Each structure stands twice: as structure tokens, then as C-alpha cells.
Amino acid sequence: RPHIRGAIREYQTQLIQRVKDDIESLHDKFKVQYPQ
Amino acid sequence: KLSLNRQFFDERWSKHRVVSCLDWSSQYPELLVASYNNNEDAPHEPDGVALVWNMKYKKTTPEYVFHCQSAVMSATFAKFHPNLVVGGTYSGQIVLWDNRSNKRTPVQRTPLSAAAHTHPVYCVNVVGTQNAHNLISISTDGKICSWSLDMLSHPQDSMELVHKQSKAVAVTSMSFPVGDVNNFVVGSEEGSVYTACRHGSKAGISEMFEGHQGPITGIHCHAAVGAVDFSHLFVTSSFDWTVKLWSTKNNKPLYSFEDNAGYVYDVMWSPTHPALFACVDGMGRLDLWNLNNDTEVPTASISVEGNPALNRVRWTHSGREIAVGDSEGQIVIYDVGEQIAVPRNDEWARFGRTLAEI
């Protein structure tokens, strides 16, 4: 409902930076390889 | 009296270009946007190169440089986006620049699909507040398209604009009235200026009022006298050298204020001091005036240096100064100074009503 959906962008971005950092951690840890 | 303040110009990006539409900072104070036009004398340069400036910082460099592929036919800021710049183009795509990314290219370009605009958009604008907004692009093709500032690959809400007949409405610089009652007025190509709704089956073109024959160039609306009048009045601009004041219920209303020896290009009157409208010419004259003090003459007007065909002008929002866009890439900044907002200024309403009776 767009009516509801409008006022949450700030919280959304907070969650996006959370998601961001964790996928970045996945890039890091997966960039280290399984043998090592 | 006109307080000519500093000016904004840079040969690095205003090299024989045409200053297209403008806008002040709808969010910040006195940090305006300047849409430009292509210079075919420099084909290597981008066609539409927008630029901004900062009057509150008191410097000369164009603070931000932004440039899409095609010629930006319209631009302005974004509502509650202190980092964004929306934009119309000549091709039809709607661009979206960002300042903090330092990418001199817009990051979210509207496609060139039939669902989008494939004709230049002279008036693209945000509408309401924080949750009451959208982005409505209205190209000259005759379509409106609501867009979120997030999703841009498809218009949120979109329909055409036709009259009772299925003929097109070549819009040019539409404007929503005060409050976003979705009954935006549309400056058509020539005459047949319309009021158009957005919600309901009756959305779109409401009625035609014709009071001038030259092709339209602009329109504007305004607000309260200090909570005295309704102020739904909207004035237009055209190529017949005359400027007519209109009403939401008349068809060939109030005296079409004509400036001779000049091709009228724009009107915009600050709601601060209910009536202070400024028109422009194709000669280098800013003949602005108030309808309460004067009747049919420019009050505190001025001409411009040389003969620049003044393309667009915008009052500095929530205050007073004047942005000036020419046919040549150069921005001039004037101010009224002495034309302060008169308190209890209902003289104009009495004036317009007395004129309206004849």
C-alpha cells in the first residue's frame, strides 16, 4: 500500500547498509579460499 | 528599483549555449538549478549540461556539473532528496543525477519505451510532501507519467492528455496549483490552456479557455495574501506578447497584460507579496510588476545588459531575488529589495475584482 510504503526509506537504508556490510563480508570470507 | 546582485556564469560550460528552465532550491535555501541547452558548435561536449550555483556561499564556480547525453529541456531539484537532481531531456528520457557519487552522468535514466516519454519533457516535477510525492513527467507528446524516485524503469501512474476530441495536447510548462489538488494547469502549445485532474475517471483535461493566440511559453500559480485570499489565480505567457491572468471558472478573463517590443517567454510570481509577477522579453528586459500598485505598467522593472532573449526567470522561493535565464548561456541575479511583501495587501484582490466586473 503506497500510503503505508512511503514513510520508511530511512529505516530501509539502515537495513540496506546492514545487508551491504554482510554481503561484503561474504565477498571477503569467500575471497579467502576453501583450501586455506 | 531592482537590486542587481552578483551573477553566475562560467565559460567552461555556458559556451554559447541556451539557458533552459531553472528552479531554486526547493529544499535548501538559495542554491539554484540551471538547465541548459546543447551548443551545436561544440559537438564533443554533452548536449544537455545542467549546472547549479550557490548564492549562499558567495563564490563564482558552478558548484555542480551534470550532463546526460541529450539536451536537457527541463530540470529542477528533487523533493526531500538533498543529494538528487531530476531532469527532462530533448529525447524524452528522464534522467536522475546524484551529487555525492561524483558521476557526471545520471545514474537512473528513464527508458525510451512507449510507456515512457519519447518526446521532450518541458515540465517534469515532484508533487507533494514526504509521503504525498511522486514525479510527474509531461512531455510534449501529450502523456503524463507518475514516477517514484526509486523505480524509474516503468511509470507508477501514467495516462495521456487529450481533450474531448482525440487530438493531442502539446503541453509546455504545466504547473500544479497550491496544495497539489492534482488540478494542474497546462500551458498547451498555443491557446487552449487547460486544467487537468489526476485522480478519478475525470482525470486529465477539464476545459479549454482561450484568451490569446500566440504560442504559450509558461504558466504559474500562487498562494495566500497572509491567509486572506483563496489565490487560485494563475497567469500565463505566450508569443503574442501578452500575459493573461486566469481563473478556475472563467474562460476569457482578466486583462491580458501585454508588453510590447518583446516576445514573452515566462511568468512566475512569488506567493510572498501575492502579486509580483515578472515577465521577460526577446530583447533583454525584465518588466516585472504588481497589480495592486500599478494597473498596466511595469512597477520596478529593469532591462538587461546587451540584448539577451530572457528565456526563464524564477523568484527566489520564500524570499526575494530573481533568477534570470537568457538565450545565451548566462545567469543574472536581480532582486527587488525595496518591493517588500506589503502587509494586508488585499488591494490587489479588490483591484482584480473591480476589473473583473467589466
UniProtKB/Swiss-Prot annotation, chain A:
Homodimer. The cytoplasmic dynein 1 complex consists of two catalytic heavy chains (HCs) and a number of non-catalytic subunits presented by intermediate chains (ICs), light intermediate chains (LICs) and light chains (LCs); the composition seems to vary in respect to the IC, LIC and LC composition. The heavy chain homodimer serves as a scaffold for the probable homodimeric assembly of the respective non-catalytic subunits. The ICs and LICs bind directly to the HC dimer and dynein LCs assemble on the IC dimer. Interacts with DYNC1LI1; DYNC1LI1 and DYNC1LI2 bind mutually exclusive to DYNC1H1. The chain holds residues 594 to 629 of 4646 of the full protein. Belongs to the dynein heavy chain family. The gene is DYNC1H1. It comes from the Eukaryota. Dynein heavy chains probably consist of an N-terminal stem (which binds cargo and interacts with other dynein components), and the head or motor domain. The motor contains six tandemly-linked AAA domains in the head, which form a ring. A stalk-like structure (formed by two of the coiled coil domains) protrudes between AAA 4 and AAA 5 and terminates in a microtubule-binding site. A seventh domain may also contribute to this ring; it is not clear whether the N-terminus or the C-terminus forms this extra domain. This is Cytoplasmic dynein 1 heavy chain 1. Cytoplasmic dynein 1 acts as a motor for the intracellular retrograde motility of vesicles and organelles along microtubules. Dynein has ATPase activity; the force-producing power stroke is thought to occur on release of ADP. Plays a role in mitotic spindle assembly and metaphase plate congression. It is linked to Charcot-Marie-Tooth disease, axonal, type 2O: An axonal form of Charcot-Marie-Tooth disease, a disorder of the peripheral nervous system, characterized by progressive weakness and atrophy, initially of the peroneal muscles and later of the distal muscles of the arms. Charcot-Marie-Tooth disease is classified in two main groups on the basis of electrophysiologic properties and histopathology: primary peripheral demyelinating neuropathies (designated CMT1 when they are dominantly inherited) and primary peripheral axonal neuropathies (CMT2). Cortical dysplasia, complex, with other brain malformations 13: An autosomal dominant disorder characterized by global developmental delay with impaired intellectual development. Some patients show signs of peripheral neuropathy, such as abnormal gait and hyporeflexia. CDCBM13 is associated with variable neuronal migration defects resulting in cortical malformations. It is found in: Cytoplasm, Cytoskeleton.
Swiss-Prot record, chain B:
Keywords: Acetylation, Cytoplasm, Cytoskeleton, Disease variant, Dynein, Host-virus interaction, Intellectual disability, Microtubule, Motor protein, Phosphoprotein, Repeat, Transport, WD repeat. Pyrophosphorylation by 5-diphosphoinositol pentakisphosphate (5-IP7) promotes interaction with DCTN1. Serine pyrophosphorylation is achieved by Mg(2+)-dependent, but enzyme independent transfer of a beta-phosphate from a inositol pyrophosphate to a pre-phosphorylated serine residue. Transmembrane segments: none annotated. GO terms for cellular component: centrosome; cytoplasm; cytoplasmic dynein complex; cytosol; dynein complex; microtubule; vesicle. WD repeats lie at residues 14-63, 67-107, 116-157, 166-206, 211-256, 259-299, 305-344. Its main location: cytoplasm. It is found in: Cytoplasm, Cytoskeleton; Cytoplasm. One of its GO terms (biological process) is transport along microtubule. Disulfide bonds: none annotated. GO terms for molecular function: dynein heavy chain binding; dynein light chain binding; microtubule motor activity. Belongs to the dynein intermediate chain family. Homodimer. The cytoplasmic dynein 1 complex consists of two catalytic heavy chains (HCs) and a number of non-catalytic subunits presented by intermediate chains (ICs), light intermediate chains (LICs) and light chains (LCs); the composition seems to vary in respect to the IC, LIC and LC composition. The heavy chain homodimer serves as a scaffold for the probable homodimeric assembly of the respective non-catalytic subunits. The ICs and LICs bind directly to the HC dimer and the LCs assemble on the IC dimer. Interacts with DYNLT3. Interacts with DYNLT1. (Microbial infection) Interacts with human adenovirus 5 hexon protein; this interaction probably allows virus intracellular transport. It is linked to Neurodevelopmental disorder with microcephaly and structural brain anomalies: An autosomal recessive neurodevelopmental disorder characterized by global developmental delay, severe intellectual disability, microcephaly, dysmorphic facial features, and cerebral malformations including simplification of cerebral gyration, agenesis of the corpus callosum, and brainstem and white matter hypoplasia. Acts as one of several non-catalytic accessory components of the cytoplasmic dynein 1 complex that are thought to be involved in linking dynein to cargos and to adapter proteins that regulate dynein function. Cytoplasmic dynein 1 acts as a motor for the intracellular retrograde motility of vesicles and organelles along microtubules. The intermediate chains mediate the binding of dynein to dynactin via its 150 kDa component (p150-glued) DCTN1. Involved in membrane-transport, such as Golgi apparatus, late endosomes and lysosomes. This is Cytoplasmic dynein 1 intermediate chain 2.
